[PDB]
């Protein structure tokens, strides 16, 4: 059922009946008991006797004013204050009272160790005063903020301070002034002692922007690449989008204790730490690239999100498609294009796709929602972005941008819909896209079926592309999509053959709109080999039926990069498949000579660009592989990659070792070029791990050793567990001596305990709870132990007696009370119950079936077990 008291409906969404212009809030702080003064300027659009509905949760409420009355026309409900007999305009006084120190679940005001910060989105901001928590009430903000020095000494708020002073007993205040108009999740409020990185940017227009990143006191030396990565994406966004910032500062926050990554408040974005703090001897390659995105991606917000906001939360993939398109795109233009992509593609179909098969399963603009904080998703994020992305397919460059700017030029200062931005690309394109808009209000992912003719006496080369999507279970009706279907033709010579049909170029995006049509190209001098959907043109599986030649030959010949890794993982799934069946039968490997000999041209090619290289050679991971099956068989499918790493070790030992030498770098540098040989050689030491155990030891111990860097001696610490070489307890005793003390670092060698292979890696597991660097009450802890144990270490989490299972749920009974949005994500492993065999799925049906019997179970587990058990 779709039908829940509790589940809000997109179709339901009416403007409001009071709106609010500006809002004046102080906070007296204080981490037992803050006060808040929230004093709003409101206007009624609805009917005289409509009353106002404020929303707010565990405040306490302490005096309720009208136009400086106390009001006695109100009255308290469930998660409300609602005041009737209301004037037209009216100056709204609340006072209230909560408590940061008692806020476990870090949704509202709480704290970060000795700091108090915010964050308010979704529906935060409730839990911080009553007022109309919904992102079409847009209002300016003055905010002051009163507490005491010693403790407090940083007291900030999105925009300029405007005031400032000192009380006696040693309390000070500040006030801030933001004037642009927003939505109540997009204010922030920061307080504590840090040091602050200072810098500068001047945009294209000549206005200087302050750049402060404050960090907690001793990690400064961890802060300037995030500050170089902020001044890249102000640069970025003005080159690519021609969009500058609008504001005098710009403020970032680290804090340690974060439910999610990063937080795009109004010139005062808070940053979990991880994607903020890093250097060489710290951080890894990928987490650079990483800090990177998510910095990129919060200021990109700034337009896509902030000048311009969502209506109401269906819309979220208004912003969160959009912004991911443009942090996907300016990591593509500063690094490497084809690594960008192939990492972006190994998301969608191998997490993704799973969740649009899993009871979970919503189109990119949801109809229904009990939770909000359980639509931060891999559809709406990522198969959000692969939908503008397809807007960019079908328009080009030029017209997407002309889009772009009349979506602003419409709908700056405004909360918008998906409908308007999709509306403003059609109008300024004019290309239509009336069809192309299904894809916004179906779920499930498309399947697309491709047959092909050559037809010697015509050269003509036909093409019977059908396409359906399957009832997913949150909808039973489908229809086609407007799919754009990039192709390329290649001859015998692996050069690409012109599309023509009646002697005009054709372009090389087809529109499939049809369950089935035909196309027919002329001039076609050569029996091709296709690349179809090239660039993954479209977010859907393919169903063609490849040779192992053509594959290979697109490794060699394939024009562009993607093409060639996409080609290869098509020949891998093939004996995926082969082996996976051959495990459940008890038998060893089976790999042809040639399909090896593609992976040693690869290794051989001198050509060839190190970065692609390095994808090529990177086995697809367990959950890209469980795509593959339609009942998943989660130890056949750890087993297969790990026998497969060492078929090719063994036959490749040679070249393994060679390029491995080859690609040695005396220095240490954070450099695309540098990064890839990196890649590469540490793609091949993976591998070298898996072959003869005395040369493995030592390769990979020495590397350990003698790294000057958290790249190389992570890849080493990695391989030693994977492969569980002599050397990987004494490794990993010796970076928990060193690191302990420091949390994300540490969450690398909880990742490393969690996704052992090891036969008693459960039992490690639990003892990790009671671990030095362990704790259940912060959200990157339990995610680096918890959460990869059960989403990224299938055969344990999986072990056929269910101890997985219950592990899982004990920890759940209590995340449930402390941090709700922690346990739902958290819980995703065992609503996938369905994918798997009669006897775990039972399992996993009595687990839910115990949590559903949880005392207090939290409106976020609750809307995923019920979806699961249904
Ligand atoms: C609701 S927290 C998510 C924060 C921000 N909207 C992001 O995209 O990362
Ligand atoms: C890959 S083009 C060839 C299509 C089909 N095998 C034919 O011979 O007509
Ligand atoms: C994944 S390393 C194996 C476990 C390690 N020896 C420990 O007990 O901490
Ligand atoms: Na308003
Ligand atoms: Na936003
Ligand atoms: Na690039
Ligand atoms: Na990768
Ligand atoms: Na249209
Ligand atoms: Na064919
Ligand atoms: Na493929
Ligand atoms: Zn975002």
Request: proline residues 4%; aromatic residues 10%; hydrophobic residues 40%.
């Amino acid at each position: 059922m779709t039908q829940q008291p509790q589940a809000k409906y997109r179709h339901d969404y009416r403007a409001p009946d009071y709106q609010i212009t500006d809002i004046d809030l102080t906070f007296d702080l204080d981490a037992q008991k803050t006060v808040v003064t929230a004093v709003s300027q409101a206007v009624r659009h609805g009917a005289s006797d409509a009353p106002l509905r404020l929303n707010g949760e565990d405040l306490k409420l302490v005096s309720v004013h009208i136009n400086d009355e106390p009001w006695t026309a109100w009255k308290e409900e469930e998660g409300a204050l609602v005041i009737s007999n209301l004037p037209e305009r009216f100056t709204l006084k609340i006072i209230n009272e909560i408590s940061p120190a008692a806020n476990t679940a870090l949704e509202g005001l709480y704290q970060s160790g000795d700091a108090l910060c915010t964050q308010c989105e979704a529906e935060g901001f409730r839990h911080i005063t009553y007022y109309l928590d919904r992102p079409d009430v847009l209002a300016r903000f003055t905010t002051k903020i009163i507490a005491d020095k010693i403790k407090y000494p940083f007291l900030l708020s999105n925009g300029n301070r405007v005031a400032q002073g000192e009380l006696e007993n040693g309390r000070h205040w500040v006030q801030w002034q933001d004037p642009f108009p927003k939505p109540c999740y997009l204010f922030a409020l920061v307080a504590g002692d840090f040091d602050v990185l200072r810098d500068t940017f001047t945009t294209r227009s000549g206005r200087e922007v302050a750049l402060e990143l404050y960090v907690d006191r001793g990690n400064l030396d961890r802060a300037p690449w995030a500050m170089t990565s902020l001044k890249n994406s102000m640069k970025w966004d003005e080159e690519r989008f021609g969009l500058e910032y609008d504001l005098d500062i710009y403020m970032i926050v680290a804090v340690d204790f974060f439910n999610m990554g990063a937080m795009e408040n109004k010139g005062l974005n808070i940053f979990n730490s991880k994607y903020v703090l890093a250097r060489t001897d710290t951080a890894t390659d990928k987490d650079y690239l990483d800090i990177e995105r998510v910095i990129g991606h919060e200021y990109f917000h700034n337009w896509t999100g902030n000048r311009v906001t969502c209506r109401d939360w269906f819309q979220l993939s208004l912003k969160e498609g959009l912004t991911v398109f443009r942090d996907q795109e300016f990591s593509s233009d500063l690094g490497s294009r084809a690594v960008n992509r192939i990492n972006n593609v190994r998301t969608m179909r191998g997490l993704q796709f799973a969740e649009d098969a899993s009871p979970m399963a919503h189109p990119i603009r949801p109809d229904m929602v009990i939770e909000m904080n359980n639509f931060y998703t891999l559809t709406v994020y990522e198969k959000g972005a692969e939908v503008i992305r397809m807007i960019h397919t079908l328009l080009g460059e030029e017209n997407f941008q002309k889009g772009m700017q009349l979506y602003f030029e419409r709908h700056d200062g405004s909360a918008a819909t998906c409908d308007d931005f999709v509306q403003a690309m059609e109008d300024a394109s004019n290309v239509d896209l009336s069809h192309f808009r299904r894809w916004y209000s179906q779920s499930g992912t498309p399947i697309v079926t491709v047959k092909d003719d050559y037809n010697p006496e015509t050269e003509q080369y036909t093409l019977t592309i059908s396409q359906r999507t399957p009832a997913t279970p949150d909808q039973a009706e489908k229809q086609p999509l407007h799919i754009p279907f990039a192709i390329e033709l290649y001859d015998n010579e692996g050069k690409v053959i012109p599309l023509q049909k009646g002697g005009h170029p054709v372009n090389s995006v087809l529109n499939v709109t049809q369950a089935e049509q035909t196309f027919v190209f002329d001039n076609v001098y050569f029996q091709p080999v296709p690349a179809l959907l090239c660039e993954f043109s479209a977010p859907v599986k393919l169903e063609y039926k490849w040779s192992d030649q053509q594959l290979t030959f697109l490794m060699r010949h394939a024009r562009n990069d993607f093409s060639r890794w996409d080609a290869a993982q098509s020949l891998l799934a093939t004996y995926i498949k082969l082996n996976v069946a051959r495990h459940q039968q008890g038998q060893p490997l089976s790999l042809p000579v040639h399909v090896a000999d593609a992976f040693r041209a690869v290794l051989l090619d001198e050509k060839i660009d190190p970065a692609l290289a390095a994808e090529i050679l990177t086995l697809p991971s367990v959950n890209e592989m469980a795509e593959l099956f339609d009942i998943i068989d989660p130890i056949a499918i750890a087993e297969v990659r790990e026998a497969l790493t060492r078929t090719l070790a063994t036959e490749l030992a040679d070249e393994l070792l060679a390029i491995y030498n080859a690609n040695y770098q005396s220095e240490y540098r954070v450099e695309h070029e540098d990064i890839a040989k990196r890649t590469l050689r540490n793609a091949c030491l993976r591998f070298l791990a898996f072959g003869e155990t005395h040369l493995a030891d030592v390769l990979v111990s020495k590397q350990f050793h003698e790294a000057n860097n958290m790249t190389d001696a992570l890849a080493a610490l990695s391989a030693a567990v994977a492969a569980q070489l002599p050397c990987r307890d004494a490794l990993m005793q010796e970076y928990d001596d060193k690191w302990h003390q420091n949390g994300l670092v540490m969450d690398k060698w909880f990742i490393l305990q969690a996704t052992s292979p090891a036969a008693n890696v459960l039992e490690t597991v639990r003892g990790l709870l009671q671990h030095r660097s362990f704790t259940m009450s912060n959200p990157n802890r339990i995610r680096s132990l918890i959460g990869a144990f059960a989403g990224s270490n299938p055969a344990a989490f999986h072990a056929e007696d269910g101890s997985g299972y219950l592990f899982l749920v004990e920890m759940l009974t209590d995340l449930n009370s402390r941090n709700p949005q922690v346990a739902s994500r958290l819980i995703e492993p065992l609503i996938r119950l369905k994918r798997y065999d009669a006897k775990r799925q039972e399992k996993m049906r009595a687990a839910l079936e115990q949590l559903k019997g949880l005392e207090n179970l939290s409106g976020d587990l609750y809307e995923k077990i019920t979806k699961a058990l249904a």
